[PDB]
Amino acid sequence: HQKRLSAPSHWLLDKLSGAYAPRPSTGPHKLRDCMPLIVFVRNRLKYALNYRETKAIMMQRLVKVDGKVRTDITYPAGFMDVITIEKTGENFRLIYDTKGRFTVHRITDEEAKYKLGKVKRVQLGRGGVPFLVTHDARTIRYPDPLIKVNDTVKIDLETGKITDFIKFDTGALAMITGGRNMGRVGVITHRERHDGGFGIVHLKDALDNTFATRESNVFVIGSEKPWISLPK
Amino acid sequence: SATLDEFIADEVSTAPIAEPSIGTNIVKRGRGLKTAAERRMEEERREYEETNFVRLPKESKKERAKRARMEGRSGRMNFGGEEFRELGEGAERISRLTKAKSSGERYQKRLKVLESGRGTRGK
Amino acid sequence: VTLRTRKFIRNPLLSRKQMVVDILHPGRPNISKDELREKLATMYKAQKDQVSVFGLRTQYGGGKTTGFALIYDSPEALKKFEPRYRLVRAGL
Amino acid sequence: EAARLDSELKLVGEYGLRNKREVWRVLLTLSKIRRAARILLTLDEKDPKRLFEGNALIRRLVRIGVLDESRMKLDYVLALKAEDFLERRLQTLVYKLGLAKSIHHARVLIRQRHIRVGKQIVNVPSFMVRLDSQKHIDFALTSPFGGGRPGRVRRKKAK
Amino acid sequence: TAAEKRLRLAQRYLEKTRKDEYAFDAEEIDRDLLAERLKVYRRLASELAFDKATYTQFRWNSGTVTSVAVCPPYAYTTTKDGYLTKWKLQDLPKKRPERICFAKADARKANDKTYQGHLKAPLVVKASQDGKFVVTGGADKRLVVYNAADLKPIKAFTQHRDAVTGLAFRRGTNQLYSCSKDRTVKVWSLDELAYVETLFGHQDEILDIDALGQERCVSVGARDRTARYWKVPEESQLVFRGGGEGMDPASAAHEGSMDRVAMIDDDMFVTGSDNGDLALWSIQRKKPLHVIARAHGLEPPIKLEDYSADEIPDPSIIPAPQPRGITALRTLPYSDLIFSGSWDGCIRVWRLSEDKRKLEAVGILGVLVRGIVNDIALFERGGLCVVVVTGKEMRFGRWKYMKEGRCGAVIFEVPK
RNA sequence: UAAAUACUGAUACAGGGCUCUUUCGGGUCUUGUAAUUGGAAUGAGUACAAUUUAAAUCCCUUAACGAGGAACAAUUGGAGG
RNA sequence: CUAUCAACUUUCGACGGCUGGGUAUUGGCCAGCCGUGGUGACAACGGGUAAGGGUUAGGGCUCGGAGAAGG
């Protein structure tokens, strides 16, 4: 039940939606790194007008998020969730811009079929099996045995299996998803360890601005290989 | 930077500024004129009523308490169509911006006047 | 009685045609939005019963009047997708 | 004092004003403008504050039509006066454009909604008409001097 | 020096404010989503043979013909006797038109009601490109509009307050822009025969108006030296103030009025001013893009035998001659053609530059058509026929009467 | 904060009106009247509607009425005959 | 803020370490065993009660203990 100004500055609200703002329900993505489905439908896309209209869209099986039907209105969809609407025949993708806000991208089924997800941790689960945890809280059982931490994975999204992976690399272009230099698509050119907590990388854009961002806030997107269509 | 921004648009930048047709910026049968700042807000209220076309409440008691108190603490005044700003801190920025923005032919004549004996004497 | 439709939006998931309507009565009194529902049947090839009009503020000095019009694909789609107060104002 | 009484009576008579509150209102806004001009004359020439703020003040007064387009110095902005402001009022502009026979006729017309400034009719006689908007003062279309219905006493007589 | 110091400080502030292959834009991509949720340029300035133009310089029983419109088979003349004559033009595979019908102003029925039609002589005429509406406005304070075929008046708008001076159609639409002599311009929706909106803002009387395919106008007013570009839906304007600046030096006159206007495409237009200035104006710029001076030269100095009544005529005193200003000015839409006619006896044609940021001369067209060129109308055969309307005096007033010249429609075409 | 309680003519008749330093004195020249008549303009109010809105109201549109003093009724103080 | 506050803690253990208990877990948090501590003129301790942070042209905007008649 937070106010419209206490809502974060990256899912935008104008002077229109009242003094209050919806809170995202608990789910895969975080609270402050989130776009709820009602803000995506009626405050960003404007396929709806009111809360009851958004409910009348959501309750019938017309909005699918990451390939599954998401019914509740304030479902969290933070980063790179393909959002398939079949009556309009569109699939939107959530990326950022250079200023630090949410951006929507229209696309069809060929790029809508896969999800590029960053690995959070690799472990040995119960049954003596290695399993893999992404930032979408997707756990994949029996992964490829080189996919370590901070590697990204092309998730199939019709079975959910691994298809390809991109390694953490000095020389692979990356996207920033946090910090004071948030949302700046550039190339990882250096990486400093700082063992004892909070190591960094040094990263430059396409046009020569060096800056240091933390290896938590980084997010690998591809060496050149823009596997998701960043908007031209 | 308020007085400085209007100097560029009208004297420096070679681009014509949209002027309203004369009777359009009159509020309530003449009771006020809409200044170019207050007019630009009024389109922003209107340009939000065709996007998803839900109507608005024409202000409320809690916004009118705020914006009419803004006149109480400001030295602005609107004598005509224009605004007349006070000469306080808005004048000091004009000085404060401009300080960071500022941060062998001779010898021949001598031998050509040393050759001829002399022209004449004192008349 | 002169009509123009700006910003016509399809909206298939809510199944309703969204029009910003600028109507003009010069010299007449106001437009009687039930008769405007009757007028927005042959302009967009629909029944009168599946049209709902709201907004509808008259501009200063007569003439122009801005309304917002929604035409549903069926009266039952209107019945299951309309608010109660707009349904009462329409008469269903 | 008799000087203040005779001065305010000359203003109220020469421009058809209602009381001395309108005179004191104009004298207050004139003193505000003139105080801003004196404060800008306090600074030396070619200070950027004086340059841009005085250019803003002079362009504002020339655009609202009080200060003449010939003289554009801050000394003439100091030499401004309340007769120039009351001349820029709407009621004296109707009297000088000749839609009305006297200034009290002009106040009567503006009160009962005959003239219009540009597009919209103007109900207030103290409307500060700008220089660009001075030309578009005319009778409205709903007025019997403009057109439409022949009017009220005309209707009662023609019945 | 204070002005140049302000210019220096402002340019420094511009440099400070000024002080990306993967750059994105949330609000601009949102405007893209909303827009996705919701007039060819020609260059025929060299493809015509102006020296090989074929002309019919004829005339008929009239006082002085004022204006013409081009319905594509037809023509529509207005004459100060009070006639509007609908005429049929010619085709090549006989060089004078055959008049088919006319309508006369009846001033006897000014008192008599339900008479749509003029009381006094009309001044301008325009024809809709459909061919079903023809509109004409005069100094009788009213603008009438009717059917093109039977030429019988169906509507007589009385909304203007002084006189109707300029009149223009939106191309491809029946939206009308009529600019008047009470410094206003009223836009009409002629499909329902109704007035939709008025537009104020002009300082002096409005002399000309031009329109194109969009819902815009460009209107020139006379002695304020101002062309105003008109955004009709949002009701806004853009001001363009001229202030125009071996021969005698006193003969160089500044821009007195701004008589004629012609929109050549969406982004720029051209204005003709009675000191003989022809100025190309761009909407992106606040200044003239390119002004050319004395576009029809100076007048001849008047004779001593009329200027002084003396037994000796001495040329020691004679005033400096003034430039013959543009009386008519037209263009083809989305072309490079600037037709300008003064009372020099010749009808000049200009063109654009290859960068379209300059005006250039291509020469005199009739290589005379004497009189005062009141009007120009253009038509394409498929190779263009232009009619030029000339009389003994100007359009709106009998200021300069000329015993030379004829009350003639002069029809000439360029076949290449 | 904005501003209603009136605007504008014609005719008839009276010969005085006003001022001051200097006062049984000087200065200036059109002013009146509870006179007779004529024009228009109309917003306060009354008000069919439609619209606004959860339902109403206000606002914006708006057909029809709506001015001669004895009224659609200006007040608060001070000085004097 | 104050030395008209220079000693304070061990006066509900004051500082450890060992062992357990209890806690969702660490921990003198609590219980048994012993060791001698701990802070302080670089301002402890005591006393007075008058209980801001972030967003940076600016102002604005945002966030901020005890009781349900008495133990």
From TrEMBL, chain A:
GO terms for biological process: cytoplasmic translation. It comes from the Eukaryota. Keywords: Ribonucleoprotein, Ribosomal protein, RNA-binding, rRNA-binding. SMART domains: S4. Belongs to the eukaryotic ribosomal protein eS4 family. HAMAP family: Ribosomal_eS4. This is 40S ribosomal protein S4.
From TrEMBL, chain B:
It comes from the Eukaryota. Residues 59-123 are annotated as: Disordered. Residues 59-74, 82-95, 106-115 have a biased composition (Basic and acidic residues). This is U3 small nucleolar ribonucleoprotein protein lcp5-like protein. The chain holds residues 228 to 379 of 381 of the full protein.
Automatic annotation (TrEMBL), chain D:
Residues 88-159 form the RNA-binding S4 domain. Residues 1-87 form the Small ribosomal subunit protein uS4 N-terminal domain. GO terms for cellular component: cytosolic small ribosomal subunit. Keywords: Ribonucleoprotein, Ribosomal protein, RNA-binding, rRNA-binding. The keyword Ribosomal protein applies. GO terms for molecular function: rRNA binding; structural constituent of ribosome. This is 40S ribosomal protein s9-like protein. It comes from Chaetomium thermophilum (strain DSM 1495 / CBS 144.50 / IMI 039719). The lineage of its organism: Eukaryota, Fungi, Dikarya, Ascomycota, Pezizomycotina.
UniProtKB/TrEMBL annotation, chain E:
It is found in: Nucleus. The chain holds residues 95 to 608 of 630 of the full protein. This is Ribosomal RNA-processing protein. It comes from the Eukaryota. One of its GO terms (cellular component) is small-subunit processome. Coiled coil: none annotated. Keywords: Nucleus, Repeat, WD repeat. It comes from Chaetomium thermophilum (strain DSM 1495 / CBS 144.50 / IMI 039719). The lineage of its organism: Eukaryota, Fungi, Dikarya, Ascomycota, Pezizomycotina. Transmembrane segments: none annotated. WD repeats lie at residues 157-198, 251-291, 326-360. One of its GO terms (molecular function) is U3 snoRNA binding.
